[PDB]
């Protein structure tokens, strides 16, 4: 079972930006070993005015092959996964509150999956925001029965390489390795 | 709420080609409602400094928001999906045999999932290949206890517009609109 990394949070919080920067090496660019995307998910809006006025939107899943289909078995979607819960630090401690429904949803979907909390927009946040978010996390999110285990929490500018991002990148790799190894333990 | 269309088959069969032609649609609104991809799935190859067994690949799922994560609940993945099963007609009747493990796998995901069978590469298919495939489908795939309900089967050139491609587009729309119904007759 290839380890899944699930990047969740609210729209605009910097998830795609954060992943871009995490994967940014350009020693080999982004050299994936398949010529085609394994799973392509896109919406297909269909206007059917000849039919009973029902503008139908299909959520289309294009699978490369059997390996990619197999990887979406409910067993694999719900078990072997590290979660990144991403929020915009520049919007303050309200965004930490908004991580709570995410953490309930992660615990429900994937009961064994650990979470790394990532505050983006550090560069456009102030110490008052940094401090209030830090306090709220340690008091209200860390080591709570009913939430995923929170392995670590980071504050990053997701648009650039930095010590804090390298540490996050290290944590995701190390946390992925260690997660795979423990679940083999009896 | 929102039906999933699952396009499945072996690599090189023409799945991505077929979808891009289907989605050219009626040369009207090209507009995709979101500025960003709802679900982006990428492989992240990582070279690790730690020695011994090394070089780990992460399968990364980048979710736009709460609606996209919710949409991947196993309930919707398994109980709200229509399947396009795609094979390369130009490789002959052996590709119809290779659809059988696919149909077993689909049945296991959800007993009630309908499948539309599509043979691509009609344009570079011999007439005898097409006849052997039609015969094999009708004898061995259609109306089988243990396979999904095969609603219809199609032979198309997936690279261009045709009457056959338009009929496939109509079948997908009708099967989407009538998803619950024909299951309800037996169940
Ligand atoms: N200044 C700053 N902008 C960021 C940061 N992270 C994300 N952004 C910006 O936030 C906006 C939304 O980012 P995106 O990756 O699309 O968010 P997503 O919807 O969570 O995938 C974009 O304009 C990004 O450039 C950050 O750390 N600092
Ligand atoms: N001549 C012809 N080529 C096709 C047809 N459908 C797909 N192809 C070609 O088959 C190759 C693989 O197609 P692709 O859509 O990438 O297949 P996928 O791996 O199943 O997604 C490409 O070179 C396509 O142009 C068809 O109906 N006729
Ligand atoms: Mg995004
Ligand atoms: Mg899942
Ligand atoms: Mg493809
Ligand atoms: Mg499914």
Q: What secondary structure does DSSP assign to A34-51, as a single string?
A: SSS-SEEEEEEEE--TTT
What fold does the segment set A4-24+81-184 form as a domain? Rossmann fold (3.40.50)
Whose CA is closest to A51, among B172, B4, B80?
B172
- Chain B closest CA to A63's CA: distance in Å? 6
Which H or E element spans position B46?
strand B39-46
Angle at A39 between CA A37 and CA A42, to 5 degrees: 105
Contacts of A11 in chain B (CB under 8 A): 36, 64-65
Whose CA is closest to A16, among B57, B31, B77, B65?
B65
Domain ranges in chain B are: 4-24+40-186
Angle at A48 between CA B29 and CA B15, to 5 degrees: 70
Please tell me if residue B142 touches chain A, with a CB cutoff of 8 Å: no
Resolution limit in angstroms? 2.0
The answer to whether residues B87 and B96 touch, using CB atoms and an 8 Å cutoff, is yes
Method of determination is X-ray
In angstroms, the CA B155 to CA B134 distance is: 9
In angstroms, the CA B98 to CA B117 distance is: 12
- Closest partner residue to B173 (CB to CB) among A7, A43, A56 is A56
Structure tokens given for B2: 């929102």
Ligand 1 atom closest to the CA of A158, numbered from 1 = 27
The answer to whether residues B32 and A152 touch, using CB atoms and an 8 Å cutoff, is no
Coil vs helix vs strand at B119? strand
In angstroms, the CA B103 to CA B96 distance is: 11
Structure tokens given for A62: 């294009």
Q: What is the arrangement of strands in the sheet containing A4-9, beginning at the earlier edge strand?
A: A150-155, A115-120, A81-88, A4-9, B56-63, B39-46, A39-46, A56-63, B4-8, B81-88, B115-120, B150-155
Q: Which CATH superfamily is domain B4-24+40-186 in?
A: P-loop containing nucleotide triphosphate hydrolases (3.40.50.300)
Q: Looking up tokens 């979101």, which residue turns up?
A: B34
The answer to whether residues A61 and A37 touch, using CB atoms and an 8 Å cutoff, is no
């Amino acid at each position: 079972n290839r380890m899944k990394l699930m990047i969740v949070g609210n729209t605009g919080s910097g998830k795609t930006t954060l992943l871009q920067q995490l994967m940014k090496t350009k020693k080999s660019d982004l050299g994936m070993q398949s010529a085609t995307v394994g799973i392509d998910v896109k919406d297909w809006p269909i206007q059917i005015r000849d039919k009973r006025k029902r503008d139908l939107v299909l959520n289309v899943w294009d699978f490369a092959g059997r390996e990619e289909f197999y990887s979406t078995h409910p067993h694999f979607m719900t078990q072997r996964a590290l979660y990144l819960a991403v929020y915009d630090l520049s919007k303050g401690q309200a965004e930490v509150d908004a991580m709570k429904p995410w953490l309930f949803n992660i615990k429900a979907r994937a009961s064994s999956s650990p979470v790394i909390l990532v505050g983006t927009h550090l560069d456009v946040s102030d110490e008052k925001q940094r401090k209030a978010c830090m306090s709220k996390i340690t008091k209200e999110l860390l080591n709570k029965r009913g939430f995923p285990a929170i392995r670590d929490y980071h504050f990053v500018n997701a648009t650039e390489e930095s010590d804090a991002l390298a540490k996050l990148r290290k944590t995701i790799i190390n946390e992925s390795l260690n997660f795979k190894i423990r679940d083999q333990l009896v």
